[PDB]
Structure 1
Amino acid sequence: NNYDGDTVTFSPTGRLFQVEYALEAIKQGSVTVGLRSNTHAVLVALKRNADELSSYQKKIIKCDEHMGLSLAGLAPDARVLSNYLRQQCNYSSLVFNRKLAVERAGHLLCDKAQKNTQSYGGRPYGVGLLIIGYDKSGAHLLEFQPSGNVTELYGTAIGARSQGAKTYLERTLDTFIKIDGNPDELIKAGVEAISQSLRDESLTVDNLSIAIVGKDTPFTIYDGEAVAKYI
């Protein structure tokens, strides 16, 4: 009310309203799902269009050969943060000849988002990210929120009506975690998970966006006729 003019101001109950309003931009964004087994990690993203004449907004971004994310909210802020991740992944490779740990990737994003919530003039990032990766300690899935809070998970979903997919994964936890050495079945579980967040619309060929990374699988994105198999 009087305490939401900028990010530098606390409310009387100890809340940062500008950070909460940035969190609200994620809820308006299109649904995206993340899940993993022990061998692979999968991102499934429902892309959104302006109208029938427009293209469908690309949700998934590649950060390295072994890491990438899906976005929900302000797409330009996802571009800034993914570009920062690309640089940090790349710094780790050039200097240390070392693939950046997915856990460190999260720690770096957390600290970058935080600085914007404590200084006058700037603003919080208006986007949530689901980072998947395969590193030296196996498959990983992370959930980034622009408050700074990063969380490692077996599965999750963010965006509009994400609670439907998140409940499904909470039931399916024991099944999909043991889909080892089988990419297609892990994707099928992710496609079935995102389907629980659909209302009126269904998954079409140029609407669905899938990405996968794993043991002997680089981070690759599937769009168009390549995802027709999973409808």
Structure 2
Amino acid sequence: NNYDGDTVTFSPTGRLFQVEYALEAIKQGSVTVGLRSNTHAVLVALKRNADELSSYQKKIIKCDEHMGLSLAGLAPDARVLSNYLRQQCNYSSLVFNRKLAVERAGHLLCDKAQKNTQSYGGRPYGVGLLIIGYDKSGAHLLEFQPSGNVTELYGTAIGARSQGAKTYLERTLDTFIKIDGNPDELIKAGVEAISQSLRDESLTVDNLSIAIVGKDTPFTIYDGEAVAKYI
């Protein structure tokens, strides 16, 4: 009310309204799902269009051969943060000949987002990210929020009506976690998960976006006719 003019101001109950309004931009964004087994990690994203004449806004971005994310909210902010991740992954490779741990990737995003919530003039990032990767400790899935809070999970979902997919994955937890050495089945579980967030619209060929990374699989994105298999 009087305490939402900028990020540098606390409310009387200890809230940061600008950070909460940034969180609200994610809720308006299109649904995206993340889930993993012990061998592979999968992103599934529902893409959104302006109208029937437009393209479908790309939701998934590659960060390295072994890491990448999906976005929900302000896409330009995802571009800034993904670019930062690309550089950090790249610094780790050039300097230490070391693939950046997915956990460190999360820590770096957390600290970058935080600085924007404590200084005058700046603003919080207006996007949520689901980072998947495969590193020296196996498959991983992270959830980034622009408050700074990063969380490691077996599965999750962000965006509009994400609660449907998040409930489904919470039920399916024991099943999909043991889909080891089988990419197509783990994707199927993710495609079924995102289907719990659909209303009036269904998954079409230029609507669905899937990404996968794993033990013997570089981070690769599937669009167009390549996702027709899963509808």
Q: Say whether the fold is shared (TM-score over 0.5).
A: yes
Following superposition, the deviation at residue 20 of structure 1 comes to 0.1
Q: Deviations over 1:39-80 (max 9, x none)?
A: 000000000000000000000000000000000000000000
Provide the TM-score with structure 1 as the length reference. Answer: 1.00
Task: Output the CA distance in 2 between the equivalents of 1:122 and 1:183.
Answer: 42
Q: Deviations over 1:163-200 (max 9, x none)?
A: 00000000000000000000000000000000000000
Q: Which residue of 1 aligns with 2:36?
A: 36
Following superposition, the deviation at residue 90 of structure 1 comes to 0.1
Task: Output the CA distance in 2 between the equivalents of 1:201 and 1:8.
Answer: 40
Following superposition, the deviation at residue 81 of structure 1 comes to 0.1
Task: Output the CA distance in 1 between the equivalents of 2:114 and 2:167.
Answer: 29
Following superposition, the deviation at residue 228 of structure 1 comes to 0.1
Cα root mean square deviation, aligned: 0.1
% identical equivalent positions:
100
Q: Deviations over 1:69-125 (max 9, x none)?
A: 000000000000000000000000000000000000000000000000000000000
**Any unmatched runs of 5+ in structure 1?**
none
Q: Paired residues, what number? A: 231
Q: Deviations over 1:24-46 (max 9, x none)?
A: 00000000000000000000000
**Aligned-partner SS, 1:168:** helix
Structure 1 segments of 4+ aligned residues over 6 angstroms from their partners: none
**Any unmatched runs of 5+ in structure 2?**
none
Q: Deviations over 1:189-218 (max 9, x none)?
A: 000000000000000000000000000000
**Aligned-partner SS, 1:147:** coil
Task: Output the CA distance in 2 between the equivalents of 1:106 and 1:116.
Answer: 16
Following superposition, the deviation at residue 145 of structure 1 comes to 0.0
**Aligned-partner SS, 2:22:** helix
Task: Output the CA distance in 2 between the equivalents of 1:164 and 1:186.
Answer: 18
Following superposition, the deviation at residue 149 of structure 1 comes to 0.1
